[PDB]
């Protein structure tokens, strides 16, 4: 047809609008638990941003820099224990859709634990066993920017994950644990939509 | 003229929350130390819950139910034996 001929010597690279699903899973990190929490702010144990770009050296961050905007279709945190059943401690995790809250400002532990128990999708369990945790949906379906924070976090992150210690790390014989324990590790099972391709600084 | 129209009907609300963590001790010191945790049983006494925020929107309340449910944190290689109860007289104080 005419088109291959017109193509033959005109510099027109095509535009490429459109979505792109990608699926994967990644290893986020190790998690510790102190024997004698008392700072109240110390009860929080592992905050995380819920953005593709925030976990260096993973497949997510590598892929994330190559586009412009993103939306998770599911973001499912998973926890794998590395502790003997004889030991005792209790733990909860919750995801929060609003990046600007920061629980830690509260001076009393009870209010932290109660705020955590509130909000849908929250989870608490013994730190001896595996569990799985979900995001809540947002009806509007906004796109979010990729990359490191610039001025306002709300343009970027869909949310924040909080890993919160409850009770105290505890030993056989029931003495409170000295120092720290490696406990377990966090994982992610994700699906994402990307929009317009690029590279960014 | 503008008038807030009147109501007298009572309104139920079903739900569930979270009271808090509790501990023990190896030494029966004092013997007044046997009491270990104390909680008032009212709406608007549990900060961090949705219900305490809800509670200021009305003058009066009545619980029709209030089931506490203890959840273990410990393996069967330990023991303490514990009791729990709900006194209905707020003035009463065991500690004395």
């Amino acid at each position: 047809g005419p088109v291959p001929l017109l193509e033959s010597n005109s510099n027109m690279r095509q535009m490429h609008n459109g979505m792109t699903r990608v699926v994967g899973s990644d290893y986020l990190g190790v998690v510790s638990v102190a024997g004698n929490p008392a700072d109240a702010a110390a009860k929080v144990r592992k905050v995380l941003s819920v953005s593709p770009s925030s976990f260096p050296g993973t497949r997510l961050t590598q892929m994330s820099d190559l586009w412009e905007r993103y939306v998770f279709r599911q973001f499912r945190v998973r926890y794998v224990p590395s502790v003997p059943n004889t030991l005792a401690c209790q733990v909860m995790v919750y995801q929060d859709t609003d990046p600007q809250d920061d629980p830690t400002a509260i001076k009393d532990a009870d209010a932290l634990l109660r705020q955590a128990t509130a909000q849908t999708g929250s989870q608490q369990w013994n730190f001896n066993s595996a569990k799985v945790i979900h995001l809540a949906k947002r009806s509007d379906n906004q796109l979010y920017y990729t990359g490191p924070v610039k001025e306002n976090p709300r343009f970027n992150q869909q949310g924040v994950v909080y890993f919160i210690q409850v009770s105290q790390a505890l030993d056989m014989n029931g003495k409170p644990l000295t120092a720290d324990m490696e406990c377990g590790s966090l994982y992610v099972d994700w699906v994402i939509d990307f929009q317009t391709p690029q590279v960014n600084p | 003229s503008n008038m807030r129209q009147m109501h007298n009907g009572m309104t139920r609300v079903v739900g569930s929350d979270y009271l808090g963590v509790v501990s023990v001790a190896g030494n029966p010191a004092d013997a007044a130390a046997k009491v270990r945790k104390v909680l008032s049983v009212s709406p608007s006494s549990f900060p961090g819950t949705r219900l305490t925020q809800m509670s200021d929107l009305w003058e009066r309340y009545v619980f029709r139910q209030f089931r506490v449910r203890y959840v273990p944190s410990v393996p069967n290689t330990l023991a303490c034996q514990v009791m729990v109860y709900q006194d209905t007289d707020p003035q009463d104080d065991p500690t004395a």
Partner: peptide, 8 residues
């Protein structure tokens, strides 16, 4: 912010 208010 709602919670900080109820705690003195």
């Amino acid at each position: 912010s709602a919670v900080e208010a109820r705690l003195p």
